């Protein structure tokens, strides 16, 4: 990144870290730093079951690490044509830098376009904690009629889910329970449509095919709306 953006990152570190000035003076220009291996983009035998491939995809995403630096290294414009977002995903594998949740969703799409028997659809969450609202997103997946997820989060239980849930409702309710355990109340779930496996597609990702107001719907209608969305996607 260019020199001005680099200084901005370190200036931001100075404010958000207790001894922020100390952190930069220990790291900047240091000659003894660890050499970080560039993670190997996983490739797949045709004999490998898709769930096993997904474990390798998630492992790769995890190796990049969650970006806690305070500076997002890849700008994601969500209305860009898919082909542009896939060019960016390729650059993420080249630059091999830490990522956050939305970048992980784009990467997960890029790395599963070779899996036409897998459908991929974004799931975003709006939660409420300590008077304030928080946004999160994962890549929902469907293999052989069972639901799972790929993604990246600060918490282990708000990203990867093996494709074992027999309904979309059960997948989303698992996220809701995980949020509950860290004292977040789930307010909205926004679910997209299946994403094209063509990395040169000019169509946009559809991020908000269903926008579900959890409290206004109530338990049973929340579940029915999730099952309606799952039907919309299968057809």
């Amino acid at each position: 990144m260019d020199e001005a953006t680099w200084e901005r990152m370190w200036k931001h570190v100075a404010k958000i870290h207790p001894d922020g000035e100390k952190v930069a003076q220990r790291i900047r220009g240091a000659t003894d730093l660890p050499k970080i291996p560039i993670p190997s983009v996983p490739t797949f035998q045709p004999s490998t079951p898709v769930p096993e491939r997904l474990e390798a995809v998630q492992r790769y995403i995890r190796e990049l690490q969650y970006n806690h630096t305070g500076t997002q290294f890849f700008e994601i414009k969500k209305s860009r044509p898919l082909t542009g977002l896939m060019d960016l995903a390729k650059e993420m594998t080249k630059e091999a830098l830490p990522i956050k949740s939305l970048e992980a969703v784009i990467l997960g799409i890029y790395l599963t376009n070779s899996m036409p028997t897998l459908e991929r659809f974004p799931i975003s969450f709006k939660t409420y904690f300590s008077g304030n609202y928080f946004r999160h997103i994962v890549l929902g997946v469907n293999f052989a009629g069972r639901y799972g997820a790929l993604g990246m989060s600060r918490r282990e239980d708000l990203m990867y889910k093996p494709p074992a849930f027999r309904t979309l409702s059960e997948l989303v309710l698992d996220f809701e329970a995980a949020y509950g355990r860290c004292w977040h109340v789930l307010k909205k779930v926004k679910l997209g449509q299946s994403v094209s496996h063509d990395p040169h597609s000019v169509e946009q990702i559809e991020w908000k095919h269903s926008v579900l107001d959890v409290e206004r719907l109530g338990r049973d209608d929340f579940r029915k709306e999730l099952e309606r969305h799952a039907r919309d996607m299968r057809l």
Binding site: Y133, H136, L158
Partner: peptide, 6 residues
């Protein structure tokens, strides 16, 4: 939209 990144 509303709220910070989780």
């Amino acid at each position: 939209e509303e709220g910070e990144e989780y």
